């Protein structure tokens, strides 16, 4: 029964995962629970003003994807794949891209 | 030390390539003048000098009431401003140092500068695909490639000058991102994309090639986390940046031209998550969830991908881009797009004429990219194979093909040279192998020299003639010049009321607006086909009926271009059939039928055998007024037309609602004043 | 002023010199030991 | 499919596309023209002269065939550089690929000299 | 007419709740700042970054783009210098 | 009359203050309009007057701002930037 497979999922995940990654997996959940609720609003009240909806939504999707990219560049299991990238360079890049994102959404929110 | 000599030889080669790229485009300035060519560049020039004078915020808000009277045009809402912003920035930088260059010169010489920078961008872009020895070849090839020069000669101030620089810079940044897997390079690729989106309408090509590359990397099973980070970052950033441009608006989200990228984004997420669950669960515990989850989320996507189209909520393909997917559409559905002979499909002759050696070397660069596949080389394979098709659909797009043709020809020739030059490593059948290698190296040197002489000949003879001026050679070989276009526009500029409205066919609208500074009815950017049809109906209709339209639109003057005294084949008489078609295309025009102007035999001719409606339309009467008595040639009777090679049929007539205001020295341009309403209420019959 | 013939000659000579120099570069590359160690 | 099996399809596509089949389909010219003899008969003409922007159906296949021989010649040579191949074959490959590379180029340049009287003149 | 203001204010207050759930997770999972230090670069970095994020409200309310970039160049330069120094220090400490 | 090609508005000018005048709201449509007066009456002189007047679309600064229907979308970005900041605080110093 699927509840049993989910139990065998969480029994692993909670044991296997460094704390700095659980932190990210909670931040991603906050992002996703904000974006899903913006969407459920948009399709309840209506598309106007499409500018502000599309800005706040793409701001959520962008912050989610930048968080997943941090969640992947920093993971030691991928050091063989992102050669030459230290965790600190990945964090500087994450703040660079998040700065561009929060500038352009501020262009588009209005 | 060896490193010094390698660096010296790289620097020397690249600086010669840059100097050649800049210098080969000057032929047009040396032959005539530092002046802007063609029709379309004049709108870019006027808008650039506007931005250089009024400042950004007044250019962006700018609304122009001198064009498309009485509708006007929203300029900043309907333009790609990147070229103008670039020119204004360079202008202000030079003026800051008090290098007070005239803005016209900055515009004229802007294209050579960026067509020099593209040689360095092409060097690095090829170096990252192969080695520096291939990048030097690709630079030297793209320096002179005539297909690119054809759109980039000095004074050819049009977007295609900047677009290929932004395009190659975007491909360099994307290749760096995919090779490296770094968010920094993804954000720099997003900024390069945003720059390109601001500067040319062809950005849809990149936002449709990159998703296809990612898809091909998935199907091959090469997809790995570097591609996920690159794609999802380039997608979110380039989307929210491209949506900034007011002419782009919501199209990146609400148009089927961009849904390929969103589909690949969603499928990247599904694949990145299945790759994780398959890594956590055991097979017997994975398979049930795998098949169930796919049988739900695939069904969701399969439904939404239908609903989006069936509702029409996602806009369908625009007729232009669809005419790129189906060559037959525009010739049946939009005669404006049909009328521009630049949209004809490409024959083998133009491929040889514009590329020569590259046509022979491109399959070898492809053979190398297929021999040594890699996650970055699949990009160049896809770019090549896509441009090879789209260039065949429409000659104008050869510009997009020339860069990849040069990169692949450079890879191929590099692989040949570096193959055979290894057999010449004597210095630290063997004599046969050495003479074979020497002969093949000589053959390659010979080919590369012939490519230089071909490209220089083509650049000199074909693509360097202007079009605001006409040229001929007298029997002594002196250049005869006809300036009649500028003479007529200057006469308009000085000797007519400053509020007068000049009616003209839509080709000349940018010229009248730039040189004459008078209001016009219709213009090259045919954003209102109804208005163009309303002008064609007035040109094609009879002189009694056309007056009601000219008085309806409050016209002051009408201008026609007549070649029959000089053999200028591009006159308004040849355009007449297109003016008839467009005038009859609107429902208000159904009395205008093309079959009425042909003779019963089914031919168009203006001599005595011509249709009695053709001989009485407004345009024929404007072109051939008084002309019937001109001794056009010594062996020909009076009224011989140099272009139809026919003696006109209706020689003597009076104009009743127009008076001849000015006919230029060679009659090349004729302008009439539409007579004011008769003072006594008499009818004009 | 320089004519378009003098420019055409100058550009032909730059082109030939460029391609001959690249065909030298390929030799200076392949003779390198460090490129193949 | 394997990489070679895709490359073969791309080469075969290059043949047709470079021969301008997309021009033939929609403009649909004949394979050759004909022109009056001084005695009034018709001689066929293979090339639409002076029209750089125009083509007959077979002219494009002829030109693209020369282009394909030129492209494949270097592939034959690079194949020819292998050390396993008995030398009596090797000197052939250096023959066939070399004469492909030269003769196809020269014939294409002559065909373009035929299309444009005044080309490089 | 618009949609009713009572639902606008409803959703505008509902969207704050995920920011409470974030803290309700972090506090109860084990989050910490005990590795923080008062080294000058570490304070200057967070000051610069906080001001960089605050500038976006002033841009949204008052400034234009050219003014915003004329401030953000300076504030990003100083934040980048302090971030680079602080991250180098952290990298050494991590790798020791 | 207020005319672009056909008349968009036609109204009587009131006799006020020694002058003929009217106050009215311009149409929803931008273009190069003309005011016209065309007092053609039997036996009186034909009076014609016209003044060309361009009507332009709104400037981008004049669009509506702080629409209260959109407060959720403002609170979204002003939540995301705060979450990002607090995360940048915790991630480095945990």
Author numbering:
A (entry chain M): 4 to 113
B (entry chain I): 10 to 437, 449 to 705
C (entry chain K): 1 to 37
D (entry chain J): 28 to 148
E (entry chain P): 535 to 630
F (entry chain N): 356 to 449
From the paper:
The dynamic ribosome–translocon complex, which resides at the endoplasmic reticulum (ER) membrane, produces a major fraction of the human proteome. It governs the synthesis, translocation, membrane insertion, N-glycosylation, folding and disulfide-bond formation of nascent proteins. Here we use cryo-electron tomography, extensive classification and molecular modelling to capture snapshots of mRNA translation and protein maturation at the ER membrane at molecular resolution. In sum, we visualize ER-bound polysomes with their coordinated downstream machinery.
The near-complete atomic model of the most abundant ER translocon variant comprising the protein-conducting channel SEC61, TRAP and the oligosaccharyltransferase complex A (OSTA) reveals specific interactions of TRAP with other translocon components. Ribosome-centred refinement of the most abundant population, the SEC61–OSTA–TRAP translocon, yielded a 4.2 Å-resolution structure (focused on the LSU) with poorly resolved transmembrane helices (TMHs) (7–10 Å resolution). Recentring on the ER luminal domains resolved those at improved resolution (6–8 Å). The luminal part of SeC61 reveals a short α-helix, which we assigned to the SEC61α plug. Here, we observe the plug in a displaced conformation stabilized by SEC61γ and the oligosaccharyltransferase complex subunit OSTC. An AlphaFold-based model of TRAP could be fitted unambiguously into the SEC61–OSTA–TRAP translocon map, requiring only minor repositioning of single transmembrane helices and removal of low-confidence segments. As previously observed, the cytosolic domain of TRAPγ tethers TRAP to RPL38e and the rRNA expansion segments ES20L and ES26L. Our results reveal the position of the TRAPα transmembrane helix, separated by a 2–3.5 nm lipid density from the major transmembrane part of TRAP, which comprises TRAPγ, TRAPβ and TRAPδ. In addition, we visualize a contact between the previously unresolved C terminus of TRAPγ and the amphipathic SEC61γ N-terminal helix at the cytosolic face of the membrane. Near the luminal end of its transmembrane helix, the FG and BC loops of the TRAPα fibronectin-like domain associate with the SEC61α hinge region, which bridges the pseudo-symmetric N- and C-terminal halves of SEC61.
